[model samples]
Target: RNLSDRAKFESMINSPSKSVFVRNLNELEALAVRLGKSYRIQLDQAKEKWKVK
Candidate 1:
């Protein structure tokens, strides 16, 4: 994801700011899946909202 977009996402989730970098697809999806447990937003939804690949 774009760095700024990821920052926005982190903010949305109330997480502290940190270095942002591109993760492998597997890692990224894993995080999204895990976040699903706490957030109603799904992985695909986040991707679209963030305008990410």
Candidate 2:
């Protein structure tokens, strides 16, 4: 919760180990492969519920 600067936020966004979703297609695909399509589907649903746009 302590994103004090742009650099910190950028680092957080690029970190693969971070739990927060970053909208990287490659990363999402990798996670989807590892977690299964169903999980990704559910995750997309969850994201949709809170999507800003």
Candidate 3:
């Protein structure tokens, strides 16, 4: 993905349209929300692989 300049990134960080999980949150919250989604998906895939059904 193309990276925005500092001003552009700051503008988005301040935008209203950005998700509650994205906008106005601290850096840790932003990363936690983003990484948590990925981790949840990986757990689901691992569960499916067992075919214990």
Model 1 clash pairs?
none
lDDT of 2 by residue, 1-53 (tens): 55333333334335433235545434554555465677567446544544623
lDDT of every model, 2 decimals: 0.46, 0.47, 0.39
- Using TM-score as the measure, the top candidate is 2
Per-residue lDDT, model 2, residue 3, is 30
RMSD, every candidate, angstroms: 9.5, 10.9, 13.3
Q: After superposition, which runs of candidate 3 have C-alpha atoms over 4 Å from their true positions?
A: 1-35
Give the winner by lDDT.
2
What shift in Å separates residue 19 of candidate 3 from its native position after superposition? 39
Number of clashes in every candidate structure?
0, 0, 0
Quote the positional error of residue 12 for candidate 1 in Å: 8.9
Residue-wise C-alpha lDDT for candidate 3, range 1-53, written one tens digit per residue:
44333333344334333244233234423433455676445334433443313
* Candidate 2 off by > 4 Å: 1-31
Quote each prediction's TM-score: 0.31, 0.36, 0.30
Across residues 1-53, which tens digit of lDDT does each residue of candidate 1 receive?
55354444455444222223233333455555555554435545555554556
lDDT of 2: 0.47
